[PDB]
Nucleic acid binder design. Structure first.
Lengths: 152, 151
DNA sequence: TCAAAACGTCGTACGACGTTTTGA
DNA sequence: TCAAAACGTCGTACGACGTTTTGA
């Protein structure tokens, strides 16, 4: 892993609480077993002028990347093992997004177990619902209950 | 004149850097000698469902109040002295808003110096701009020129 | 099959201002 | 003539999804 110092973890938990985003998706893909991918994405969208912030932010955390969208850039971390580490250390300090982080961790820890059984998959898809609910969910298309459809 | 928890200062500096607002307005009013009020505001906006978090702020910081906006809510701190204290302690831990902090600080300090000698009042009004420059301003109306041309 | 990356999308919510009153 | 509250309101990000690709 990598072990994050407490001064830094404190600041970050603050900044994540206000300006930052924890996303959980079920992505229709024909390529998979259950024909859905479970993606966890942690992300912070800054204004490209400020990319230095997201870049320093890449260097400090030591994992993940910055994508330039044009006027805006994101810091993205989709890598599961580092993500899990990041979110365990941050969770204790989160005053707002704490539950979503705990839900991301629960989802991750159970990921392998979910590939095995169909109805076990849906139990995990519900948590990626519960996560969605804790954001203001707009364009959401694929839910846990969309999956149950095909699974039959 | 409260001293703050460095643990809580770090979290807050992180929070403010992301979600916080430092606003410097030149607000024309007909009362004042120079016919402008000088106004500093540090605000945090949160959906009213989360209003407790705003209350926590009123508590941890000790001063300021929550305004219920309907579906959303603001924590406001407009009191100059508490604001100068708060920003002094927070300023070293600010990354993204760091500059704004030190302007509101340097403004607050020069306030009485501005109450007297308008050419200095102008010099200070200038600092409001530079703050508005660090935010991306949208509806900005009254500026340091707006005042000056009337001086 | 899977973890990841790559990339496309858009309706409004709210930051950052306004204006005007209170209570000295 | 002040500080400080009260209250009002708009433009363009942007957040939270989305689809598709990559390479083992």
């Amino acid at each position: 892993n990598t072990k994050y110092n407490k001064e830094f973890l404190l600041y970050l938990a603050g900044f994540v609480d206000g300006d930052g985003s924890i996303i959980a998706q079920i992505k229709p893909n024909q390529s998979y077993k259950f024909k859905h991918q479970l993606s966890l994405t942690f992300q912070v969208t800054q204004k490209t002028q400020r990319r230095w912030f997201l870049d320093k932010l890449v260097d400090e955390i030591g994992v993940g990347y910055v994508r330039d969208r044009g006027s805006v850039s994101n810091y993205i971390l989709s890598e599961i093992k580092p993500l899990h580490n990041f979110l365990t250390q941050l969770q204790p300090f989160l005053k707002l997004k704490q539950k979503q982080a705990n839900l991301v961790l629960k989802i991750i820890e159970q990921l392998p177990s979910a590939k095995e059984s169909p109805d076990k998959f849906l139990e995990v898809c519900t948590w990626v619902d519960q996560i969605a609910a804790l954001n203001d969910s707009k364009t959401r298309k694929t839910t846990s209950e969309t999956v149950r459809a095909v699974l039959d």
